[PDB]
Amino acid sequence: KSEVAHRFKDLGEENFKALVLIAFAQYLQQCPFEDHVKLVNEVTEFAKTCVADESAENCDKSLHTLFGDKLCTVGEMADCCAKQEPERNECFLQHKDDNPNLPRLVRPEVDVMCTAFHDNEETFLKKYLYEIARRHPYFYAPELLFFAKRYKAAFTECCQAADKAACLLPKLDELRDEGKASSAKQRLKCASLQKFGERAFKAWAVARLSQRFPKAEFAEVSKLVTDLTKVHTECCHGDLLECADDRADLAKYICENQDSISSKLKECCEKPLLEKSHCIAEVENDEMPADLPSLAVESKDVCKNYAEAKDVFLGMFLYEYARRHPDYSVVLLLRLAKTYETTLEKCCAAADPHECYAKVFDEFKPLVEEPQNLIKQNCELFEQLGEYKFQNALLVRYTKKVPQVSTPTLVEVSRNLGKVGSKCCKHPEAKRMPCAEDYLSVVLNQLCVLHEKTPVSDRVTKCCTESLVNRRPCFSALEVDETYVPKEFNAETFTFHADICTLSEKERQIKKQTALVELVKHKPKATKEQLKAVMDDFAAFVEKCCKADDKETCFAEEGK
Numbered sequence: 001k002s003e004v005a006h007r008f009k010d011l012g013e014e015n016f017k018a019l020v021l022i023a024f025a026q027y028l029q030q031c032p033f034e035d036h037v038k039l040v041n042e043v044t045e046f047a048k049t050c051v052a053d054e055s056a057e058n059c060d061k062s063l064h065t066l067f068g069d070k071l072c073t074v075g076e077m078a079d080c081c082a083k084q085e086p087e088r089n090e091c092f093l094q095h096k097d098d099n100p101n102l103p104r105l106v107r108p109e110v111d112v113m114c115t116a117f118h119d120n121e122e123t124f125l126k127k128y129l130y131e132i133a134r135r136h137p138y139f140y141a142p143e144l145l146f147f148a149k150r151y152k153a154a155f156t157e158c159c160q161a162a163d164k165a166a167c168l169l170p171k172l173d174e175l176r177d178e179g180k181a182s183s184a185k186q187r188l189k190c191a192s193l194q195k196f197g198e199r200a201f202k203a204w205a206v207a208r209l210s211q212r213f214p215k216a217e218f219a220e221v222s223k224l225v226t227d228l229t230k231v232h233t234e235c236c237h238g239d240l241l242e243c244a245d246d247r248a249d250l251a252k253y254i255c256e257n258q259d260s261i262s263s264k265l266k267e268c269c270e271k272p273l274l275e276k277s278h279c280i281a282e283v284e285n286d287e288m289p290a291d292l293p294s295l296a297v298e299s300k301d302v303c304k305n306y307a308e309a310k311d312v313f314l315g316m317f318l319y320e321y322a323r324r325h326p327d328y329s330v331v332l333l334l335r336l337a338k339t340y341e342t343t344l345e346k347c348c349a350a351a352d353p354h355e356c357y358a359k360v361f362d363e364f365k366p367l368v369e370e371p372q373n374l375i376k377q378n379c380e381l382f383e384q385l386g387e388y389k390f391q392n393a394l395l396v397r398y399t400k401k402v403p404q405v406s407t408p409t410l411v412e413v414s415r416n417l418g419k420v421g422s423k424c425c426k427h428p429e430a431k432r433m434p435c436a437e438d439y440l441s442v443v444l445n446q447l448c449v450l451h452e453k454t455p456v457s458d459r460v461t462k463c464c465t466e467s468l469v470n471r472r473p474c475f476s477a478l479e480v481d482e483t484y485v486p487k488e489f490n491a492e493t494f495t496f497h498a499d500i501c502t503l504s505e506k507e508r509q510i511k512k513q514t515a516l517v518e519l520v521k522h523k524p525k526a527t528k529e530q531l532k533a534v535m536d537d538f539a540a541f542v543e544k545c546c547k548a549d550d551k552e553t554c555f556a557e558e559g560k
C-alpha cells in the first residue's frame, strides 16, 4: 500500500537507484552530478525504511510527492513547486528542455576513462546515466539502464585488453549512435502520446505489433497494446519506476505466452531481464499465416458492426491490414485505416452503404503508390550524390524554405534527414517503406520539438500541429520563403581559426555545413553554382593551410 516500497521490491536496489537518478537528471537538467546523487541516496535509504515497515511515516505518499519534495530543495527560476502536487509535477514535465544548451561531453582518453572506471565504478556508471538523461529528458529510462549495462561491459572487457583504444573506441561510438537513435525514437512516442493522445499511440502499437506478431490473435495484440501504452505513458510522464516495472511485467508476459505471440522470441526470452525487454522491442517480424483471407463486396453487417464497436472494428481492420503488409510503413497503414474510417462515416450515414464503399481498396492505391515512388525517386538521387553532398542539397533547400530556423536546428535536422539514404536505401524493394518513412517520422519529430522550443515559422507549426502521419508531405510543400527580407550580413561567423583542424572530419563537415546555412541566410537568392563554389572554396582554403605550417596566421584571411 506504500508505493516506493513496492517499487523497491520489484526492481531491486540496483535498478531502483539508477531509475531515480535518471528521473532527476531529466527533470533537473542543470543541477550538478553530485547534488543529484546525494538526493538519490537520501531517497534510497528512506525507501529501505518502508520496505522494513510499509506503515511507517511518509511511506503512504505518492512518488510524485516524494520526488517533487526533494527536487524542490536545490538560471533555473520558474517556481515549479506551485502549491499542490498536480501543478508541481506537470511544471517539471513542461520545462523538460529538448535542447538544454549544455556543453557537449568531451570524451577523455581511453586510459583516463579506464582509470576512472577502475577507481569508482559506481560514480563512473552514474555519470553516464546522468549526462545522457540530462541531455535526453525523454530518454527511455529502462532502455537507458540497458545501455548502461553495455556501457559497463565495454569498459569491463576493453580496459584489460592489449589495445584498449582499438577495443573501447569502436564500442563507445556504437553506443553513442544507439542511444541517440533510441532517444529520438523514444521522443516520437512521447510526442504522439502527449501532443496527439493515447488513441494515436495505440493505433501505432496495433500497426507495428501486427507486423511484428502477425500470428498473434487480435485479442492478444490488444492486450500487448494496452500494456505498452501504459508503459510509455508512465515513462513519458516521468513515472519511470512504474514504467520499468510494467516493462518487466510485460517482458515476462510476452515470454510466458510465446505460442500466442511470435516464434522469434526464443533468444529474446533467454537474455537477462534488461536485454530481454530490449530484444523484444527490437525483435524481427514473424511470418504471416499463408493463404490468409483478404477481407469479406463484403459484409452487409459492416455498418452494423462499425456501429456496435467502431474502435474494435477499425483496430481489427488495422490489425488485419498490417499483418498482411509487412512492407507498408506504419504511417501508411495509419493513412489507410484513417481513410477507411472516414469512408465508413459517410457510407453508413448515406443511403446505400454497400455500394458507397464498394471501391475503398482502389483509392488506397494512390496512397500506397506515393511512398513507393518517393523512395524510388529519392534513393536514385541519393545514390548519385552520396550522403554528404545530398545533405548539402538539403541544407540549402531547407534554409530557403524556412531561413528563420536557427542554424543548429537546420544543420542537425538536415544532417539527419540526409542519413535516410544511408540507413534504408540498402534494403530490398520490400523493406524500404517501413525503414524510410518511420525514420523520417522520428527526425521530423526532432525538428518539431526543436521548433517547439524556439518557434519562428507559422508554416512549421502548421505541419507539426497537423496530422502526425502527414508531417513529411506537409514539410515538402512549404515552398520557398520569398518574404525573407531580414537577410542580414556578417563576417565573424565566416572568420575561422586553426582550432578547426584539431577536430574530426565529421565535426569539420558540420562547421562547413553551418557556414553553408549562414551563407544562404546572407543571400537566400544565391544560385547553386555560387553556393557550391563557396562550398569548395572554404574546403580548399582550410585544406591548404593545415597541411602547411601556418597555425593561426593564414586562417586570419578573407575572400568575401
Ligand SMILES: O=C1CCc2ccc(OCCCCN3CCN(c4cccc(Cl)c4Cl)CC3)cc2N1
Pocket: 374, 375, 376, 378, 379, 382, 398, 399, 401, 402, 405, 409, 410, 411, 413, 414, 417, 418, 420, 421, 424, 425, 436, 440, 447, 472, 475, 476, 478
Ligand atoms: O531543419 C529544417 C527546417 C526547415 C525545413 C523545411 C522543409 C523541410 O522539408 C522536409 C521534407 C523532406 C522529405 N524528404 C523526402 C526525401 N527524403 C529522402 C532522402 C534520401 C532517401 C530517401 Cl528514400 C528519402 Cl525519402 C528525406 C525526406 C525540411 C526542413 N528542415
Ligand SMILES: [K+]
Pocket: none
Ligand atoms: K551524430
